[PDB]
Amino acid sequence: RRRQT
Amino acid sequence: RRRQT
Amino acid sequence: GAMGSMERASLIQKAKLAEQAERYEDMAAFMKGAVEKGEELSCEERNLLSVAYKNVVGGQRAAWRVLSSIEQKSNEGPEVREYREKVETELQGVCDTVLGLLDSHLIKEAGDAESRVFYLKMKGDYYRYLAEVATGDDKKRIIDSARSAYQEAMDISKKEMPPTNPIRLGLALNFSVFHYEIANSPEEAISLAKTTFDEAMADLHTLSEDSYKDSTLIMQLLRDNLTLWT
Amino acid sequence: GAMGSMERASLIQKAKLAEQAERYEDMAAFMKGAVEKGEELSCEERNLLSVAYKNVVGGQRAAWRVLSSIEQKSNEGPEVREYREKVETELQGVCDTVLGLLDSHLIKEAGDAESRVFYLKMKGDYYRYLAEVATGDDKKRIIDSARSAYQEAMDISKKEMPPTNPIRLGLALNFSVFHYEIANSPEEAISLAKTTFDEAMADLHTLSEDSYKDSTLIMQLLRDNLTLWT
Ligand SMILES: N=C(N)c1cc(-c2ccccc2)c(CNC(=O)Cc2ccc3cc[nH]c3c2)s1
Ligand SMILES: N=C(N)c1cc(-c2ccccc2)c(CNC(=O)Cc2ccc3cc[nH]c3c2)s1
Ligand SMILES: [Cl-]
Ligand SMILES: [Cl-]
Ligand SMILES: [Mg+2]
Ligand SMILES: [Mg+2]
Ligand SMILES: [Mg+2]
Ligand SMILES: [Mg+2]
């Protein structure tokens, strides 16, 4: 997945 | 549902 | 306008990039500029035009419906009305922009039935979108403009296209929804959807596997609306 | 600017309507106008500001990443570069617009720790977004501006806020991602995410059911990144 911010 | 176009 | 100094091919190329980037407002401005070059559009380019403005106007309509619902609930300060008017005016601008392109001069230069039916369907679609928000002295005329564009497209498609043609089917789908929710003719909407579905079914046997999938994809949308309405 | 003639309260009201309508560019213009009224912003209004520009810049970044990938593949005519530059320039304009608001004058007027930490996190976020696309003579300075804003926010939050505070946690999350993918310090990113998660866990027992859910929602994002990175 795409890292989270 | 919402009708389709 | 602001795209007059870019090559036609470069505008088409960037419209495809903006589609991949889901930048549909950019996509529309690019295809607007391509149309204004004055050359007829190919089948692919016509779809790029339709897709771009469909998504732009699709977001505006959805926004209009949210605000309009809030407004009506508030009628059971001026800010709700004001902002709904703002979105509405912007939506009408896009609709007028497309109608301007069709009228100057995509429609009169479209001699093929495939291209002419495509543009007249678009004309009906965008008079219909104007109709969704119209309320005053010329609502009836907006509605009749949609009807007339749709009707000419249907007459040409019937004469010149097979019953499974995806553009003919999409036109029938949208003319049916026009009848149902714009013209208050729900029974016309249902008859047209049924007759369109049946005559396409009877023609599927002539099609290739690829055309078969294109046609049935849209026959299912006709079936979905029939299921919703009956 | 163009919102100078609308009441502050009316701008806040319409920013909430635009949020419900998913019109985030409208939402941002409204909150920009509200900030420029010159009054400090309440906690809710600060969140309306952040949400609006997050979504606007979020679409631009996603578009930039698509086009940038296409561009690099093409480097294994000028149109791909040109359109990526266009999106990039527009993204940098929004980033500069937010940084201008923080600097004029939200930050210097923010005396509370909750409000000051909130704005300094935002400052780091938008220097980081500029860093994601920077390549030239002052990339390092952009990166250091993000680091410095993040670092001051972390020092204040540590002194003045409990380890479970959602803003402190969101700040730690984003400072950790800065370390990982901007500063090329993956081990700093992992330590910060772990230490932040653990110290919040040890503080959950002091919280109400509602605050418990707010904090753990963001602790899970820290856990997700830890899981991705190790
Ligand atoms: N970039 C794009 N979006 C497209 C490029 C081309 C294209 C055209 C010619 C040559 C190359 C590409 C497209 C072709 N679509 C159609 O013909 C009609 C159709 C068929 C099925 C459905 C289902 C919902 N709507 C539908 C519309 S769409
Ligand atoms: N209109 C909106 N979008 C909001 C209005 C208010 C608000 C504030 C004060 C009074 C009334 C409403 C919001 C409050 N959010 C927070 O405090 C921080 C938080 C917490 C959890 C998560 C998970 C992902 N991100 C998160 C951010 S958000
Ligand atoms: Cl307004
Ligand atoms: Cl460009
Ligand atoms: Mg040329
Ligand atoms: Mg009946
Ligand atoms: Mg006032
Ligand atoms: Mg190690």
3-state secondary structure D181-221: HCCCCHHHHHHHHHHHHHHHHCCHHHCCHHHHHHHHHHHHH
CA angle (D154, D59, D194) in 5-degree steps: 30
Minimum distance, in Å, between the CA of residue A1 and any CA atom of chain D: 8
- Nearest CA, atom 15, ligand 1: C47
Nearest to C49 by CA among C98, C3, C117: C98
Minimum distance, in Å, between the CA of residue B4 and any CA atom of chain C: 6
Report the alpha-carbon distance of residue C49 to residue C34 in Å, rounded: 9
**Token pair of C113, please?**
């039935």
Alpha-carbon dihedral angle through residues C66, C71, C74, C78, given to the nearest 10 degrees: 130
Nearest to D167 by CA among D57, D50, D61, D55: D50
- Residue where the block lists tokens 């290739």: C208
Q: List the single residue in C with minimal CA-CA distance to B5.
A: C174
What is the interface size between A and D, counted as CB pairs within 8 Å? 18
Q: Which residues in chain B are closer than 8 Å to C226, comparing Cβ atoms?
A: none
Kindly determine whether residue D224 and residue A1, on different chains, have CB atoms separated by under 8 Å: yes
**Token pair of D212, please?**
């418990």
Going from the C-alpha of C165 to that of each of C36, C42, C217, the distances in angstroms are 28, 17, 11
CA angle (D133, D138, D139) in 5-degree steps: 35
Q: Which residues line ligand 2 (CB under 6 A)?
A: D 19, 43-44, 47-48, 51, 166, 170, 214, 217-218
Report the alpha-carbon distance of residue D153 to residue D169 in Å, rounded: 11
Alpha helices in chain C (DSSP H): 8-20, 24-36, 43-74, 79-101, 113-133, 139-160, 166-181, 186-201, 209-229
**Token pair of C212, please?**
């078969």
Report the alpha-carbon distance of residue D64 to residue D135 in Å, rounded: 14
- Nearest CA, atom 10, ligand 1: C44
D173 in reach of chain A (CB within 8 A): yes
Domain architecture of chain C: domains with CATH = 8-230 (1.20.190.20)
Query: Are C178 and C193 spatial neighbours (Cβ–Cβ below 8 Å)?
Result: no
Q: Quote the radius of gyration of chain D (alpha carbons, Å).
A: 19
Kindly determine whether residue D221 and residue A1, on different chains, have CB atoms separated by under 8 Å: no
Q: How was this structure determined?
A: X-ray
Residue ranges near ligand 3 (ion) with Cβ within 5 Å: C 82-83, 86
Element (H, E) at D20: helix D8-20
Mutate to test the interface with C, among D20, D23, D24, D27 (most CBs of C within 10 A): D23
Report the alpha-carbon distance of residue D70 to residue D92 in Å, rounded: 20
Q: Which residues line ligand 1 (CB under 6 A)?
A: C 19, 43-44, 47-48, 51, 166, 170, 214, 217-218
Going from the C-alpha of D30 to that of each of C116, D34, D49, the distances in angstroms are 43, 6, 9
Burial of D160 (0-12, 13-18, 19+ CB in 10 A): middle
Q: How far is the CA of C187 from the centre of ligand 6 (A)?
A: 6
Query: Are D192 and D171 spatial neighbours (Cβ–Cβ below 8 Å)?
Result: no
Query: Are C164 and C211 spatial neighbours (Cβ–Cβ below 8 Å)?
Result: yes
Q: Quote the radius of gyration of chain B (alpha carbons, Å).
A: 5
Report resolution (Å) to 1 decimal: 2.3
Q: How far is the CA of C66 from the centre of ligand 3 (A)?
A: 15
Is chain A touching chain D, with at least 3 CB–CB pairs below 8 Å? yes
Report the Cα–Cα distance between both ends of chain D, in Å, rounded: 48
Report the alpha-carbon distance of residue C124 to residue D63 in Å, rounded: 32
Minimum distance, in Å, between the CA of residue D114 and any CA atom of chain C: 30
Residue ranges near ligand 4 (ion) with Cβ within 5 Å: D 82-83, 86
Q: List the single residue in A with minimal CA-CA distance to D62.
A: A2
- Residue where the block lists tokens 């920077």: D134
Report the alpha-carbon distance of residue C4 to residue C42 in Å, rounded: 20
